[model samples]
Target: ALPDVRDGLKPVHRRVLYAMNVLGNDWNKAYKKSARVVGDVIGKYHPHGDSAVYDTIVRMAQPFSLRYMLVDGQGNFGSIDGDSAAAMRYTEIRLAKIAHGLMADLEKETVDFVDNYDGTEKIPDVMPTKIPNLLVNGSSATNIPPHNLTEVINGCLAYIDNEDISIEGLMEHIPGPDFPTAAIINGRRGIEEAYRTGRGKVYIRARAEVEADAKTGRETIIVHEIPYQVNKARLIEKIAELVKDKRVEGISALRDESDKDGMRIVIEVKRDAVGEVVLNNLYSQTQLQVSFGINMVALHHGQPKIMNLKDIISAFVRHRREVVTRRTIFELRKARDRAHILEALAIALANIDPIIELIRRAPTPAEAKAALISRPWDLGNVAAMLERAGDDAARPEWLEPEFGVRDGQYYLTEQQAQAILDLRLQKLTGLEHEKLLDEYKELLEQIAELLHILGSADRLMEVIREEMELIRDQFGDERRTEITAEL
Candidate 1:
């Protein structure tokens, strides 16, 4: 199945993430049993098989599989040597720290929500992820090689800086797809072609070294890293088969000297044999070298398209622009609601004694609320608060028209009146009373900034850029795959 370019998630992944979010399995939070996630997904969101969900979790948690992992698996999550992970019952899972970027602002109504198959649960239509997840988490879906997030972001910034930048100009920021295996890319020919046309072939080779023996003059080929997705055990088996059949002859022994330290496969060369020729033969015969075809196909705007470098980066910029814009509006709207409540509290606080007297003297709570909303209260400090909140679009909506504080008088709305009743006697302490306006001033400043960010395209994009750079500084690492032309 194809992944959505906006969030870079297949339906299953999106559902799993949503379920994890529902469980509060945050990156910083404690790990829940892996089965809990699988159970929740299959039972509520995805009515699929249990193994399907567990397998997806396993793949995401594997460091060797995902360039950047989404899940923080706490148990035995398989090996690069073709060994399988433990069962879901034994494994535990949580969202990874980097994964937080994938689901950012999810609570702020950035994306639409749809009902599940049973129509009992809600799931996101697509995540408003700040990170270009489709690019960040390269998949086997179409052999879209996993790339470096920092390089991708740099490319994004470059594209944003100049929308019309050329393929050559764009390539300056992102050199190639950085694989998790940390192997060597044969050359730039394939990368150039792929980044340009969304289709090409990159020849990957395992990083090996031929070291000479100091005592007996016997040389060994030490395999440090292998090509992406190539199994170490199978690679060694192929080499052994080649050696046994005499198809590739160094006339020596082979042993996998690998450990937790790193992958070290010692292919011992006969004392009489030439190490260079033997290694050349192994490379010619085994999976030490492989070709990773680049077919960056995905659901772009709900249509499958072969996406090039700029296209992908452009998608990210557009998605973030929309997400940040929506998020700013959500924050602005929520802030306005609080400011309304606080503004009303200022009215009630200013006329505290009379308001208290009226409430105690009233027949019912409903009567008290109605009586409070009925008359004009003293404007008190609210007039000054409203003035400081600004006069332009930055001003609170409640201030205009009938919801008025005319001259030195204020008319409280039903919502405002309810808030006054909700305010208890002990809650009106000296420090607590002062804290309301302190929060109001701070909120006014926040609302003003959010208004500016949402209203202007330039300001909105600047916020996106700022958030992207924060991810860059935290998650960016040295490129693992090196590139050099073969002779």
Candidate 2:
């Protein structure tokens, strides 16, 4: 049988939904028992063991994926707090409506099925995804930090429905990733250049919400969200330790409330603290942040390919739409053919009575074939004959319309289909993942376009000395810092 070509469900989606269902059905906290959760997932829905499942489950609670996650968890899933959960059965579990939807109306033949490990029955390869989840929930892996700019995307979606608008126009509405963990995506100008080049590095800074202390009426900045690379626990400790050691001034107290409910770090200001002095100290010292070092990353053939910001998002748009289009066209072709065959079958069933008599009287196989083939004028006549045959009790009640000579063939263009199938089947390349160079190239083009709109991909890099002069003007001592790359 032709494999079901439809929304391909990844193991992660299937396992997560399955795990959530188990949690919802059981109605108990699995907590610190991360091992139990991992075991159940492995035994039931997935073959992968505790390690991979735990990583996925923990990231679900990172306040990024589901504006809300079904799994209520604690322990180090990895920090921003950066830690893993305790054990599987120890964490509390439950189902979100989103998860419940995965099991909705799942009857045989409703969707395409693929063979299981033992080639028993088919399992769905993709979830029937209606939510624009990639953007709404953003994604975080063990290596990738949570994108703060997801809100930037959510905001962009709110504004434009047309695909033809410039990315910068879209950027105008929302700036970039607005992480709940509050990290800054640095080098906005460089990022803009990289987007044009189709690759660039993004730097991040953690945000601290602050205000003047009410009691002392002095400037105080409360640390709320830590940056990507900043160690939350250690960063807080380091600040406290700094004040204790007097390496920094104006910071009287550093308290961390990152333990239970939320992340709240209070920094008490000296009674007569100078605003500039305190602000400068916070910026210059502590994990106030240096930058997150974001290099545009994408997946190619299951490999990680880093791109510049512009190239990444643009290519992302291109890839998913192509997949969606191919899958849709493939489905349409099969449904159209099936509908045609059913129409022919309806006509054949109408003359059941006379057809039955002809079949009974025919002496030889050839005669029988001719008699059956010589049907009445149309479907209406055929139907009347079938009714007559039924009234006379010659035709059994179980007799049903033979729709076709044989089962209908599924007609689909395999090439268009294969493009997506290859992705679903996991046959793509690793080099495909490392398109950072391509992204950078695209970024350069986008910059040229932007510059042309302003007029200048070359104006900035016009001459060697001109480039050097511009750089010298921008950063004096910073130029003394030399950087090297392996490749």
Candidate 3:
């Protein structure tokens, strides 16, 4: 119940996004103060501590924090150098452009919504997300690392195209986890096991380039990136501490020259000591290397289970299918209702003179409404269109055949009669009459298409594929981390 498998968002993270959406904090909109968002989330949905919520928001906004950040912060949210963020009151935030895809179609009732803790508001059970958020922003508890958006999306599309796609097949698209830190995934065996069995461990090493002094021919190691979740300040401190304690040796000096451009931790080696040996010792004794454990556990239908890559992807695909089905159902219902009203309007337009006379003869509005329902009129061009839209069995009993037509004449329902009484004189024009007919025809076509989507699984998957492609086109970026053959 805490973490939904569909979008792989915990209760808190999901609520944060939903609350922001409610506040209209979309990607294209101006940023709202972070304090306002936190207050709403705690007061309405989560009821958690303000600090914990703010911390979550800060992390989501940090580019170095999440593989694909959910929130875009305008202030000093934090730094990869392990600094704390300023107060929420000082920060401004809005949903990231890609984050909007997570909550897409929420208004159309794509997912279930339960009453909030106080029952004063309702919140979504899970986001009707098009992005593969699970792989893109992997879980900490499971030690799952974030992956490249393009790779993960390609894998998902491949699966959608082939239901029986194998794990090896998925591997071709999503080779391994792509950490935001742009480090190196030391090996592939661990990744293969994790993807295949849902449990494994892989080594992650900081990226370092060995440079030599031209004048002195002295060697130095320049560190560029670190493993995910490794505190930069702490790691640097650890290296110095190791040198002081003599656990690792041969470093002449250690200094951090990181700036806005990128990270650069410089370590000069003693002329007597080989740079490669010193670097190996640093990796052996310091935070230069770490391991990421893959335990792909998440909530599935309110039950927690360890899920393999295929299981996780299949669950997402299942969720997309349901969301698409529900959205189609909603659109179909609206089209039918509009088409029903337009049918009555078409009849009124065709017999405008009599309708005007009937209304004029009545002493009151109720009397006109009653007289309209009591008599039958001839079926105009709309009758053929209605029949083409659907069979009579598909029509609701409230919109009974007698309500639309009885004998050769048509009798309007109370709804249609009242609508005609409210019609403006301008709608009596020929241009307005033709517009109504054109709109009715469009609605009929829309209803037919929506019906086909709900009726065919293949058609639904095609829609999913199209949506996936659109999201990819908008937010997909190059892989940050690189996977190397076993070291």
Q: On residues 281-322, what C-alpha lDDT tens digit does candidate 3 reach at each position? A: 888887789887888888889888888899988999899899
lDDT of 2 by residue, 349-424 (tens): 3333554466568786555555444432244533432233333222112323432222221121222122222232
lDDT for model 2: 0.45
* TM-scores of the models, in the order given: 0.96, 0.53, 0.94
Worst 10-residue lDDT window for candidate 2 reads 478-487
Task: Summarize candidate 1's per-residue lDDT along 1-487 as a digit string, tens digits.
Answer: 9888787888889888989998999999889999899989989987867478888899999999999999999989999987899988999999998888889889998998989999888999899887778877786747688888898889888888899999999889888888888989988999999989989998899899999878967788898999998988988888888888888877588889999888899888887788889887777777888888999998986788889878888887888888888888888888888887888898888888899999999989999999998898887655776664545343355455677555567778887899999997776898988998899889878987987886788888788779889989988888899887763
Candidate 1: minimum summed lDDT over ten consecutive residues — where? 388-397
Model 1 lDDT on a 0 to 1 scale: 0.85
lDDT measured at residue 135 in model 2 versus the true structure, 0 to 100: 29
lDDT of each: 0.85, 0.45, 0.85
Residue 443, model 3: lDDT of 77
Q: For each predicted model, how many residue pairs clash, with residues at least 3 apart or on different chains?
A: 0, 80, 2
Best by TM-score: 1
